[PDB]
Amino acid sequence: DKMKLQSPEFQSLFTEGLKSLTELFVKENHELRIAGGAVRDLLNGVKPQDIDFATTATPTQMKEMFQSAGIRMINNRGEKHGTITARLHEENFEITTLRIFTTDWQKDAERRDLTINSMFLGFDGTLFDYFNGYEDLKNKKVRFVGHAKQRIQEDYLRILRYFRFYGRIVDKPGDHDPETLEAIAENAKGLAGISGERIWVELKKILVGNHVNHLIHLIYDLDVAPYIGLPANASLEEFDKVSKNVDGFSPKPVTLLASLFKVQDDVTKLDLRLKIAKEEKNLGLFIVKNRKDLIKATDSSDPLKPYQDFIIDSREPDATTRVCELLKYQGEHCLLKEMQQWSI
Amino acid sequence: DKMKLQSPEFQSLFTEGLKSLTELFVKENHELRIAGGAVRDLLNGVKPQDIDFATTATPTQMKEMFQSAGIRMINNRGEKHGTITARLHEENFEITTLRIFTTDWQKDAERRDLTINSMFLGFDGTLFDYFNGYEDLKNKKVRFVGHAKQRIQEDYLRILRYFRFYGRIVDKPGDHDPETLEAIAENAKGLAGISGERIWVELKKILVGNHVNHLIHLIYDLDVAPYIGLPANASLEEFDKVSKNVDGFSPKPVTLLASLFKVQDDVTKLDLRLKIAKEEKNLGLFIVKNRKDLIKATDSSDPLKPYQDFIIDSREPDATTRVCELLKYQGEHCLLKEMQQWSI
């Protein structure tokens, strides 16, 4: 309450237009702060990006305010509602009202995920905690705000979300409150019901994050795999392997997942449940043995030819890309570089 | 006798100076022909290069001929007398008289080792075979002239020479007349006597010719290795390996030999017997464990660094070269290419 935030990163959020936002939201009397990640990020130093603004004003009254000041709002099919986006100077501002529904007691945080994402930030730099979140972070904690019968509390997806953050912030691996880990195990069959493209977005974040190998093992030990698209478990040999192969290079989520794929089909099983996109699918079966094993790497005069040749004869797009991820997965580090300097 | 040899290659030997030679030798009445491999080469297409001319004139009268025509002679120091060398239009022509000692009945092709090399060639394009040689070649034969009772016939070196050509012409490995193969086994203890830098020049040819892996297995199966500087029957496991690693790239003879001898010292054992030069020696121990196993290749972020670094501060010459042959031997085909594009 006496310690205000002011570091350079935060300082710059105040763009040529955020100010105009502020101006407007003030004269019209409507407390507006920034929240969620985009508050913790700031605390951690990383500039927020895709900030999630929060406002006490109802969505109803925002338009009769933006329209008034002639501010273009963007992207419809609201369906939820709540959140709104203005443009201002060509910046875009995802403004969102608080909710139980549209409430107004900054105990919106109560609705929030985990501590870390339950903070608010005045533009003073006045930090609004409410759940020792600032303390959990820094402490590298990551804990929900209703035990874990908040995981079940609708959004069963929380499961994945837990895993995702344990990736952003942790340092060591294994340091898991048995409490929530259990909460997960017990539910999880719930996941079987939350959207599907809504898990893809998260599973992809888990995959291109930290201690993937760990996280996905959990995803199996706790038996979440089945309700998340993942195929037939137990072995996790190939995974671990490919896992240590792609690590460092910037593997595409499917490149990784593909390692826990026994066979093609065992991949459409994923396309059907996640509704992944094209390419996403195509890279999958591409890797999955149609080449995973047969397209080895020479062992004689001028390697990478077997690969290049493919790209040439391929008659199907991104041949290179597909190959490159293969090389990643296959672990051929040196060929990878060579290939990333080749053309036709 | 009616079929004269006529080809583009052969036609070109008649350089702007060979003619001068011909002129003289004809005006001095002394049948001069070209012989040895230079003849078989011509038959096979490859232009001779370092042709071995033969003359009925004694080495004595050659000088009282070249001196007369003010033609400079070179590469003296005995020059294994019988063989002389003039220059003519800056070209060098190794002329040699026939012998039992300085004889003259063109049955100097008795003293010759293998049929293939016992031919002669008139500037006519006439051949004169004498031992169905043109037929052994073309038939890919390679047989001594009159039982390996000739191998023993002095020049125990013939052993190595057999191997070397069996590599030139042959196609497949295995096709060995058991007769001569035995003759080798029986003798060969003899090699222990012939020169030593005289074998190194041949062992190297064997090493950078065709079916090496074979040839050397023979060089052991027939127990020749000991009387040649090669370490006491090792295992050839590593060999076979390294052999298939270097094949294709341009391995240096030592880079290969190093394989079949894996503790330093049995490398000097080679230096002592063959009187190989530095570098050859320095490459030896260099590969030979000096780095063979310890200098692996990364397995993480940007490989080849462990190699580069070595060179960067090796405080010893050719570091690169040495390294490069290692990569060959190590089998890192892709790091080899990369390394051959690097500098400082």
**How many angstroms separate the CA atoms of A153 and B225, rounded?**
80
Q: Residue A189 is encoded by which pair of tokens? A: 């069959």
Query: CB B87: neighbour CB atoms within 10 A?
Result: 14
Query: Which residue in the block uniquely carries the two structure tokens 């409490």?
Result: A179
Query: CB B44: neighbour CB atoms within 10 A?
Result: 14
Query: Please, is B100 exposed, middle or buried when counting C-beta atoms within 10 Å of its C-beta (0-12, 13-18, 19+)?
Result: exposed
- B298 at interface of A, judged by CB pairs closer than 8 A: yes
**Cα angle B250-B254-B258, degrees, rounded to a multiple of 5:** 115
**How many angstroms separate the CA atoms of B321 and B251, rounded?**
11
What resolution in angstroms does the PDB record give? 3.4
CA atoms within a 13 Å half-sphere pointing along the CA-CB vector of A121: 27
Q: Contact at 8 Å (CB) between A32 and A96?
A: no
In this structure, the strands spanning A93-97 and A52-55 are parallel
**How many angstroms separate the CA atoms of A200 and B179, rounded?**
74
Q: Contact at 8 Å (CB) between A280 and A268?
A: no
**How many angstroms separate the CA atoms of B198 and B252, rounded?**
18
Q: Contact at 8 Å (CB) between B95 and B74?
A: no
Decide: helix, strand or coil at residue B279.
coil
**How many angstroms separate the CA atoms of B26 and A282, rounded?**
79
Q: Residue B105 is encoded by which pair of tokens? A: 């009945």
- B60 at interface of A, judged by CB pairs closer than 8 A: no
Amino acid at B91: E
- B303 at interface of A, judged by CB pairs closer than 8 A: yes
**How many angstroms separate the CA atoms of B285 and B266, rounded?**
9
Q: Contact at 8 Å (CB) between A143 and A198?
A: no
**How many angstroms separate the CA atoms of B83 and B98, rounded?**
9
Query: Which residue in the block uniquely carries the two structure tokens 């407390």?
Result: A31
Residue B291 is given by DSSP the state I
Decide: helix, strand or coil at residue A121.
strand
* Structural domain spans, chain B: 1-140, 141-344
The C-alpha of A303 sits at a distance from chain B's nearest C-alpha, in angstroms, of: 6
Contact B303 A333 (CB under 8 A): yes
**How many angstroms separate the CA atoms of B27 and A169, rounded?**
97
Among chain A residues, the shortest Cα distance to B244 is held by A300
**How many angstroms separate the CA atoms of B115 and B142, rounded?**
7
Q: Contact at 8 Å (CB) between A32 and A56?
A: yes
Q: Contact at 8 Å (CB) between B216 and B239?
A: yes
Query: Which residue in the block uniquely carries the two structure tokens 């994945």?
Result: A160
Amino acid at B279: E
Spatial strand order of the sheet with B52-55 comes to B52-55, B32-35, B120-121
Amino acid at B311: I
- B22 at interface of A, judged by CB pairs closer than 8 A: no
* Residue A59 neighbours by CB under 8 Å, 6+ apart: A81, A82, A83, A84, A97, A102
Q: Which CATH class is domain A141-344?
A: mainly alpha
Query: Please, is B313 exposed, middle or buried when counting C-beta atoms within 10 Å of its C-beta (0-12, 13-18, 19+)?
Result: exposed
**How many angstroms separate the CA atoms of B91 and A296, rounded?**
51
**How many angstroms separate the CA atoms of B3 and A198, rounded?**
87
Q: Contact at 8 Å (CB) between A199 and A274?
A: yes
Nearest to B333 among A303, A333, A337 (CB): A303
**How many angstroms separate the CA atoms of B310 and B312, rounded?**
6
Enumerate residues preceding breaks in chain B (C to N > 2.5 Å): none
Chain B residues with beta carbon closer than 8 angstroms to that of A337: 302-303, 338
Q: Contact at 8 Å (CB) between A146 and A112?
A: no
Amino acid at B95: I
Q: Residue B14 is encoded by which pair of tokens? A: 């008649």
**Cα angle B144-B150-B152, degrees, rounded to a multiple of 5:** 135
Q: A96 φ, ψ to 5°?
A: -135, 135
**How many angstroms separate the CA atoms of A297 and B335, rounded?**
13
Q: Contact at 8 Å (CB) between B16 and B89?
A: yes
**How many angstroms separate the CA atoms of A296 and A306, rounded?**
8
Task: Single out the residue of A84, A80, A93, A96 nearest to residue A31, CA to CA.
Answer: A96
- B341 at interface of A, judged by CB pairs closer than 8 A: no
Among chain A residues, the shortest Cα distance to B338 is held by A338
Strand runs labelled E in A39-198: 52-55, 84-86, 93-97, 120-121, 127-128
Rg (alpha carbons) of chain A, rounded to whole number: 23
**How many angstroms separate the CA atoms of B162 and B142, rounded?**
7
Query: What is the greatest pairwise CA distance in chain A?
Result: 74
SS (H, E, C) chain A: CCCECCCHHHHHHCCCCHHHHHHHHHHCCCCEEEECCCCHHHHHCCCCCCCEEEECCCHHHHHHHHCCCCCCECCCCCCCCCCEEECCCCCCEEEEECCCCCCCCCCCHHHCCEHHHCCEECCCCEEECCCCHHHHCCCCCCCECCCCCCCCCCCCCHHHHHHHHHHHCCCCCCCCCHHHHHHHHHCCCCHHHCCCHHHHHHHHHHHCCCCHHHHHHHHHHCCCHHHHCCCCCCCCHHHHHHHHHHECECCCHHHHHHHHCCCCCCCHHHHHHHCCCCCHHHHHHHHCCCCCCCCCCCCCCCCCHHHHHHHHHCCCCCHHHHHHHHHHHHCCHHHHHHHCCCCC
The C-alpha torsion from B170 through B173 and B178 to B180, rounded to 10°, is 50
Give whole-number Cα distances, B164 to B151, B168, B218, in Å. 14, 7, 12
Helix axes A319-330, A280-287, angle to 10 degrees: 50
Rg (alpha carbons) of chain B, rounded to whole number: 23
Q: Residue B5 is encoded by which pair of tokens? A: 């040899």
Q: How was this structure determined?
A: X-ray
Chain A residues with beta carbon closer than 8 angstroms to that of B333: 298-303
Which fold, B1-140?
Answer: Beta Polymerase; domain 2 (3.30.460)
The C-alpha torsion from B33 through B36 and B40 to B41, rounded to 10°, is -90
Task: Single out the residue of A192, A183, A280, A268 nearest to residue A231, CA to CA.
Answer: A268
Contact B337 A302 (CB under 8 A): yes
The DSSP bridge partners found for residue A114 are A144
Q: Contact at 8 Å (CB) between B275 and B197?
A: yes
Query: Which residue in the block uniquely carries the two structure tokens 């003849």?
Result: B39
Residue B188 is given by DSSP the state -
Task: Single out the residue of A50, A42, A45 nearest to residue A121, CA to CA.
Answer: A42
Q: Which residues of A are annotated as a binding site?
A: 37, 40, 50, 52, 112, 155, 158, 161, 164
Q: Contact at 8 Å (CB) between A93 and A21?
A: yes
**How many angstroms separate the CA atoms of A184 and A224, rounded?**
8
**How many angstroms separate the CA atoms of A246 and A327, rounded?**
9
Nearest to A298 among B297, B333, B338 (CB): B333
The DSSP bridge partners found for residue A73 are A86
Query: Please, is A217 exposed, middle or buried when counting C-beta atoms within 10 Å of its C-beta (0-12, 13-18, 19+)?
Result: middle
**How many angstroms separate the CA atoms of B32 and B122, rounded?**
8
* Residue B18 neighbours by CB under 8 Å, 6+ apart: B88, B91, B93
- B237 at interface of A, judged by CB pairs closer than 8 A: no
Q: Contact at 8 Å (CB) between A115 and A132?
A: yes
Contact A332 B333 (CB under 8 A): no
Considering Cα of B222, then B226, then B232, then B235, what sign does the dihedral take?
negative
Tell me, rounded to whole angstroms, the distance of Cα B27 from its chain centroid. Answer: 35
CA atoms within a 13 Å half-sphere pointing along the CA-CB vector of A196: 14
Task: Single out the residue of B280, B283, B241 nearest to residue B260, CA to CA.
Answer: B241
Q: Residue B251 is encoded by which pair of tokens? A: 């391995």
Task: Tell me how far apart the terminal alpha carbons of chain A are, to the nearest angstrom.
Answer: 63
**How many angstroms separate the CA atoms of B307 and B296, rounded?**
8
SS (H, E, C) B81-111: CCEEEECCCCCCEEEEECCCCCCCCCCCCCC
Q: Residue A46 is encoded by which pair of tokens? A: 């990383």
Q: Contact at 8 Å (CB) between A132 and A37?
A: no
Decide: helix, strand or coil at residue B191.
helix
- A296 at interface of B, judged by CB pairs closer than 8 A: no
Segment (H or E) for B61 = helix B59-66
Q: Contact at 8 Å (CB) between B165 and B114?
A: yes
* Residue B297 neighbours by CB under 8 Å, 6+ apart: A334, B303, B304, B306, B307, B330, B332, B335
Amino acid at A25: F
Query: Which residue in the block uniquely carries the two structure tokens 């996640």?
Result: A274
Task: Tell me how far apart the terminal alpha carbons of chain B are, to the nearest angstrom.
Answer: 62
Q: Please provide the DSSP assignment of B218-243 as one string.
A: HHHHTT-GGGGT--SS---HHHHHHH
In this structure, the strands spanning A32-35 and A120-121 are antiparallel
Task: Single out the residue of A280, A316, A309 nearest to residue A295, CA to CA.
Answer: A309
**How many angstroms separate the CA atoms of A276 and A257, rounded?**
13
Tell me, rounded to whole angstroms, the distance of Cα A207 from its chain centroid. Answer: 9
Query: CB B159: neighbour CB atoms within 10 A?
Result: 29
